[PDB]
Amino acid sequence: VDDSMPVETLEDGTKVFTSYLFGAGALGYAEGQPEVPTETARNALGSQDILINR
Amino acid sequence: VDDSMPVETLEDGTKVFTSYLFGAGALGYAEGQPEVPTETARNALGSQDILINR
């Protein structure tokens, strides 16, 4: 059960629901890597600090 | 022997050569020093890195 799925609308306020039926278990994905996966910088004449992810 | 020497060009496809004759040993020069002879920085929000010499 999830609240976020594609839902469309036609005129006269009628709705259409999608509801994928997968039951697969599964497809696949992998994480991989960049370089510099995380970093921090700052602005000295001001006062700030940052984060990055990428 | 060197390939790079001043070579001028006139019309009529007539080349002209220079060929310094020195046998000096020598003229002179001195090294000198800056401060910050070498440095490395980077942009944060973007992905870059740099080198400098000066």
From Swiss-Prot, chains A, B:
Domain of life of the organism encoding this protein: Viruses
Compartments, as annotated in UniProt: Virion
Transmembrane segments: none
Family the entry assigns: Belongs to the lambda phage major capsid protein family.
Subunit structure: Interacts with the scaffolding protein gp11. Interacts with the decoration protein gp12.
Function statement: Capsid protein self-assembles, with the help of the scaffolding protein gp11, to form an icosahedral capsid with a T=7 symmetry, about 61 nm in diameter. The capsid encapsulates the genomic DNA.
Name of this chain's protein: Major capsid protein
The species this protein was found in: Bacillus phage SPP1 (Bacteriophage SPP1)
Source taxonomy: Viruses, Duplodnaviria, Heunggongvirae, Uroviricota, Caudoviricetes
Entire-sequence positions represented here: 218 to 271 of 324
